[PDB]
């Protein structure tokens, strides 16, 4: 069995290997990359996502989210308070202000220590989940707006044609902006490209150990657990590496820098934080190996998780028994 310790693998495809996205994902899996839940892909030196980032300031962040924490430094939840719209140029200035800017630090490890010590005492503002793309239309390789769609994958594998679309999302971050512990909708893959700016630190639990994280989360968030049998779908809970180590939960960590891709694999729980002003682009995708994970994915039916239009068909076809209850949660 390849990668039996479930380490995060880093790949350096050549320009030739970067042509066929599906084939390269299947290659990485042949080497055991999925066992970590997360992989890093450094693009060939010849590749670029677009020519420059000099003209992005007028993108609108219609609903910036202030991430307010409750709890203790290593075990907290966050809620998202909606703020007034602002442009990317306005948000970048805000991120660089004395109130929000990255503190002085020695290295990524020192910054990670400072994040876990101090995150809860501040409320950073995240421009998340903005439909759109920063890939140039002429970029033909690993262009996250030109991937094969999940609807077409389900149709190719299972023969059933379904409604829905699959488009990318932009994330504008600042110091301390935080992504809570989650797997993807329907335990899909994700791919994330850091277009510009400061790094993003990731934590990940191997898919084969995901239920260990869930059991810890039910212990640490006991009211939330009673409310919903899949409350991590709410994407609000944080647990620090120190707490994970104290409770014997297997995980790994890695820092993504600008110009790098990360792939999350089906049922790979992940969480993380931004080091400073940055912009990422991410999208869900599927492969044949996902189908079995989609069929088994947990679902939130309490009403909190509220998701895209396109998840309807995935539940309806892959999880017909759960469909009625889940749809009640959506309505
Ligand atoms: O970058 C972020 O805030 C969160 N991204 C992801 O969870 C991802 O790409 O799956
Ligand atoms: Mg612009
Ligand atoms: Ni994710
Ligand atoms: Zn729920």
From Swiss-Prot:
A single BP term in Gene Ontology: positive regulation of chromatin binding
Reactions catalysed according to its record: N(6),N(6),N(6)-trimethyl-L-lysyl(9)-[histone H3] + 2 2-oxoglutarate + 2 O2 = N(6)-methyl-L-lysyl(9)-[histone H3] + 2 formaldehyde + 2 succinate + 2 CO2
Cofactor note: Binds 1 Fe(2+) ion per subunit.
Class of the enzyme per the UniProt entry, highest EC level: oxidoreductase
Domain JmjN: 8-50
Record GO cellular component, one term: pericentric heterochromatin
Residues modified to PolyADP-ribosyl glutamic acid: 16-17
Cofactor(s) needed by this chain: Fe(2+)
Transmembrane residue ranges: none
Record-listed Fe cation binding positions: 182, 184, 270
Compartment(s): Nucleus
One GO MF term attached to the UniProt entry: histone demethylase activity
Reported modifications of this chain: Ubiquitinated via 'Lys-63'-linked ubiquitin chains. Deubiquitinated by USP14 with the help of TRIM14 leading to stabilization.
Main localization category: nucleus
Sequence ranges assigned to domain JmjC in this UniProt record: 136-302
Binding site for 2-oxoglutarate: 126, 192, 200, 235
Protein purpose: Histone demethylase that specifically demethylates 'Lys-9' of histone H3, thereby playing a central role in histone code. Does not demethylate histone H3 'Lys-4', H3 'Lys-27', H3 'Lys-36' nor H4 'Lys-20'. Demethylates both di- and trimethylated H3 'Lys-9' residue, while it has no activity on monomethylated residues. Demethylation of Lys residue generates formaldehyde and succinate.
Protein name: Lysine-specific demethylase 4D
Organism of this sequence: Homo sapiens
Gene: KDM4D
């Amino acid at each position: 069995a390849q990668n039996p310790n479930c380490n995060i693998m880093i790949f350096h495809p050549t320009k030739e290997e970067f042509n066929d996205f599906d084939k390269y994902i299947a290659y990485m899996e042949s080497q055991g990359a999925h066992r970590a839940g997360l992989a890093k892909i450094i693009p060939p030196k010849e590749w670029k996502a677009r020519e420059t980032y000099d003209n992005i300031s007028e993108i609108l962040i219609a609903t910036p989210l202030q991430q307010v924490a409750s709890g203790r430094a290593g075990v907290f939840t966050q809620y998202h308070k909606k703020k007034k719209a602002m442009t990317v140029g306005e948000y970048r200035h805000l991120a660089n202000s004395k109130k929000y800017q990255t503190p002085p630090h020695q290295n990524f490890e020192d910054l990670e220590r400072k994040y876990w010590k101090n995150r809860i005492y501040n409320s950073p503002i995240y421009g998340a989940d903005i439909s759109g793309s920063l890939f140039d239309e002429n970029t033909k390789q690993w262009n996250l707006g030109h991937l094969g769609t999940i609807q077409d994958l389900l149709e190719k594998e299972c023969g059933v044609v379904i409604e829905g679309v699959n488009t990318p999302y932009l994330y504008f971050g600042m110091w301390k902006t935080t992504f809570a512990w989650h797997t993807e909708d329907m335990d899909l893959y994700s791919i994330n490209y850091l277009h510009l700016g400061e790094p993003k630190t990731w934590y990940v639990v191997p898919p084969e150990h995901g239920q260990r994280l869930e059991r810890l989360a039910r212990e640490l968030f006991p009211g939330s657990s009673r409310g919903c049998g899949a409350f991590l779908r709410h994407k609000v809970a944080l647990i620090s590496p120190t707490v994970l180590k104290e409770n014997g939960i297997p995980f790994n960590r890695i820092t993504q820098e600008a110009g790098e891709f990360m792939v999350t694999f089906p049922y790979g729980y992940h969480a993380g934080f931004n080091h400073g002003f940055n912009c990422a682009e991410a999208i869900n995708f599927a492969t044949p190996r996902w189908i079995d994970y989609g069929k088994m994915a947990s679902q939130c039916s309490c009403g909190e998780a509220r998701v895209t239009f396109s998840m309807d068909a995935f539940v309806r076809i892959l999880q017909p028994e759960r469909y009625d209850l889940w749809k009640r949660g959506q309505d």
